Every structure is written in structure tokens, then in C-alpha cells.
């Protein structure tokens, strides 16, 4: 099955998922000089005050912090969006070293990691129905650079020892994702896809300009996770990022001058 290696990594995904070579694939390089300021774009509304995390899961490619999405409690609206998108999970992509790990790039710069907060459009009723629609998901992407620790990440870091291998989960209640947000909500936006199989072209991407800082110790703990299951030959969970894909017939718009 698909993964991140030589024999099953991104360059192979098109065989099982031909949409990998589609017209609106993600991630992309964000050419900052090309991206046009769009005065019609609205401020992002991130309303996470009632977010209810439930659990954290090692799914064999990343770890997902999952939320209760049975009610309107953690929602993304405004920005480029029409209507209301509810938070289902967040996860990260990261590298083996600090010089790679992000999926989006900025003028070809790779960050150490990238956080994806995944939200589905309430007008389709559930996540599985939303991913079948071109406006089904809104993903908020946030870059990570290595420097000062992010205090609000440490609770995530300190549970990873308990979900080292694929298929392990742990109770993970009361985590506040507001602690992962940078100060500015300036963003770029474009139409794209999930960055993991099935690579469905259902996402409005909202990529924040301002990275968050995490410490080297925090990222090092991400890199102790395993792609393999318990007891299997150890292969560290690193370099779980898809590279930038062709922009094709898309415009990236900036919320900021
Ligand atoms: Zn992702």
C-alpha cells in the first residue's frame, strides 16, 4: 500500500490513484511575487473556543488529533469560504532534518514541518460526503520552523511515546488547538486536493503566511514515531510529505498587501 518510501512513495501514488496527475493537486509552491492580493477576500474566522478533542491516533503515515465533529463547535468560516466548515482532525507532515518537511513551499523554501487542520463543509452533512465535492473541505495549513518551543504543542509531544507504532491510539481530551496558531491570520488561498491518497480534489487551501516556532526537542519527538506496527522492523516516521505539484490552471490569492 502507499506510503513515503522509494517503492511506495509519492512518485508511485498515481498507479492506484490516477487523480495524482490531476488538474488541482496539492501541495504547490507559493510564488509570493505571483500571488495576487485580493481585496475581496475576508478575514479568516477561526472559532475554536468550544473545540472538543477526543483522541490521538498513529495511522501509519502521521498522527491525527481528532475532534468531536457531531456538533458545531470548532468551525472555520470567512476567508475565501462560503458557509461553515467543522474541524474533524489535525495532523502534521515533517522531515528527517529541519531543512525539509513542509508540503507547501514559499518561493521554494521548505519549512521543517506543516500543520494541517482539516474541516468539512456542513452543507454536505459528513466528511465522507464532503470529500466528494469540490468545495467539501477547508484545510488550514500552518508552517513550523525550529527555534523557540511552542508551549501549546507540548501536550501533543508528550503523548507520542504512547502511540509509537501504527494502529495505536490514546485518549486525548481537552486539547486546545488555539495554542497552535500564529499571531497573524494573513493567508494565501487556492483550490486543491488532499495531499494523501485518495488525493481527492475537494479542498480550499488556506495557508498562513506566518510560521509557528517549535523547538528542536519537540520536532525530534515527532521523528521518534514509527510508520511500522508494534514489533515490526523499525522505520522512523520521517519525511511524510508530498512534494509540490504543478500549479496548472490555478491562481493563488493573498489576503494581505
Ligand atoms: Zn496533511
Amino acid at each position: 500500500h502507499w506510503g513515503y518510501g522509494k517503492h511506495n512513495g509519492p512518485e508511485h501514488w498515481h498507479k492506484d490513484f490516477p487523480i495524482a496527475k490531476g488538474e488541482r493537486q496539492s501541495p504547490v509552491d507559493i510564488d509570493t511575487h505571483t500571488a495576487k492580493y485580493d481585496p475581496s477576500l475576508k478575514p479568516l474566522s477561526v472559532s475554536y473556543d468550544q473545540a472538543t478533542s477526543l483522541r490521538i491516533l498513529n495511522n501509519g503515515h502521521a498522527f491525527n488529533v481528532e475532534f468531536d465533529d457531531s456538533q458545531d463547535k470548532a468551525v472555520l468560516k470567512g476567508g475565501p469560504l462560503d458557509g461553515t466548515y467543522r474541524l474533524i482532525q489535525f495532523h502534521f507532515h515533517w522531515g528527517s532534518l529541519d531543512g525539509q518537511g513542509s508540503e507547501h513551499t514559499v518561493d521554494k523554501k521548505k519549512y521543517a514541518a506543516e500543520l494541517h487542520l482539516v474541516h468539512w463543509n456542513t452543507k454536505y452533512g459528513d466528511f465522507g460526503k464532503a470529500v466528494q465535492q469540490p468545495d467539501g473541505l477547508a484545510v488550514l495549513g500552518i508552517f513550523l520552523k525550529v527555534g523557540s518551543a511552542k508551549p501549546g504543542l507540548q501536550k501533543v509531544v508528550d503523548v507520542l511515546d504512547s502511540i509509537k507504532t501504527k494502529g495505536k491510539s490514546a485518549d486525548f481530551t481537552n486539547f486546545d488547538p488555539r495554542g497552535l496558531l500564529p499571531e497573524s491570520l494573513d493567508y494565501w488561498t487556492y483550490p486543491g486536493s488532499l495531499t494523501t491518497p485518495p488525493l481527492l480534489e475537494c479542498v480550499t487551501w488556506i495557508v498562513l503566511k506566518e510560521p509557528i516556532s517549535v523547538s528542536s526537542e519537540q520536532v525530534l519527538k515527532f521523528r521518534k514515531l514509527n510508520f511500522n506496527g508494534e514489533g515490526e522492523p523499525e522505520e522512523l516516521m520521517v519525511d511524510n510529505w508530498r512534494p509540490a505539484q504543478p500549479l496548472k490552471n490555478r491562481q493563488i490569492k493573498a489576503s494581505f498587501k
Side-chain angles (χ1 to χ4, degrees):
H1 283 275
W2 68 269
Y4 291 94
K6 298 130 195 180
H7 292 287
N8 68 0
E11 72 279 22
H12 294 271
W13 297 350
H14 70 101
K15 293 173 274 174
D16 276 345
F17 305 97
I19 204 179
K21 293 188 189 300
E23 298 300 305
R24 57 169 282 186
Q25 289 290 292
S26 293
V28 298
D29 181 59
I30 301 164
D31 177 332
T32 68
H33 283 106
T34 298
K36 199 183 184 196
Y37 170 58
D38 183 352
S40 79
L41 287 169
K42 307 190 162 169
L44 255 205
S45 171
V46 185
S47 297
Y48 291 169
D49 39 292
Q50 294 294 309
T52 303
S53 69
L54 289 176
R55 196 170 70 131
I56 191 172
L57 173 72
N58 179 336
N59 59 23
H61 46 104
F63 66 83
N64 286 180
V65 173
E66 298 167 349
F67 287 79
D68 172 13
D69 64 346
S70 70
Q71 293 203 70
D72 259 320
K73 287 197 196 181
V75 301
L76 187 66
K77 321 164 55 169
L81 303 172
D82 286 334
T84 297
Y85 292 71
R86 189 183 295 175
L87 179 64
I88 177 169
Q89 50 94 352
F90 68 79
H91 61 273
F92 303 80
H93 307 263
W94 63 90
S96 52
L97 287 181
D98 296 349
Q100 62 187 215
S102 68
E103 292 204 311
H104 294 91
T105 56
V106 179
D107 298 332
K108 301 298 182 74
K109 178 184 172 68
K110 294 171 167 83
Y111 289 86
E114 187 174 329
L115 167 59
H116 289 161
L117 298 121
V118 179
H119 314 73
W120 54 270
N121 194 327
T122 61
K123 76 192 197 191
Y124 299 123
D126 70 61
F127 175 88
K129 285 288 193 287
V131 298
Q132 302 182 58
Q133 302 292 157
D135 59 354
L137 296 188
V139 183
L140 180 59
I142 304 176
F143 296 120
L144 280 62
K145 65 182 185 177
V146 173
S148 297
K150 191 70 168 177
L153 181 60
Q154 187 60 34
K155 284 196 296 173
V156 172
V157 168
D158 279 336
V159 82
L160 298 181
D161 277 351
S162 75
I163 57 150
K164 184 173 181 182
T165 50
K166 178 171 44 160
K168 298 198 72 183
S169 63
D171 286 309
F172 198 66
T173 49
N174 301 108
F175 180 78
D176 186 349
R178 293 181 292 188
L180 301 179
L181 301 179
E183 176 184 328
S184 180
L185 294 177
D186 290 349
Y187 65 87
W188 299 280
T189 183
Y190 74 97
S193 75
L194 295 174
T195 71
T196 47
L199 300 172
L200 293 171
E201 290 181 336
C202 63
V203 177
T204 300
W205 278 96
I206 301 166
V207 178
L208 298 191
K209 178 175 178 190
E210 182 176 18
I212 61 165
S213 284
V214 302
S215 63
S216 188
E217 294 84 359
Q218 289 179 318
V219 165
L220 285 164
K221 288 177 180 188
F222 286 18
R223 299 182 182 133
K224 296 190 170 182
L225 287 166
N226 286 185
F227 292 127
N228 54 277
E230 183 182 4
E232 289 172 3
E234 183 170 37
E235 175 77 337
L236 296 179
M237 183 180 283
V238 296
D239 295 318
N240 60 350
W241 52 273
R242 189 188 191 191
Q245 300 299 309
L247 189 61
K248 299 191 169 173
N249 187 47
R250 296 176 288 177
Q251 282 194 354
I252 306 181
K253 296 172 182 186
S255 73
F256 59 92
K257 319 172 81 152

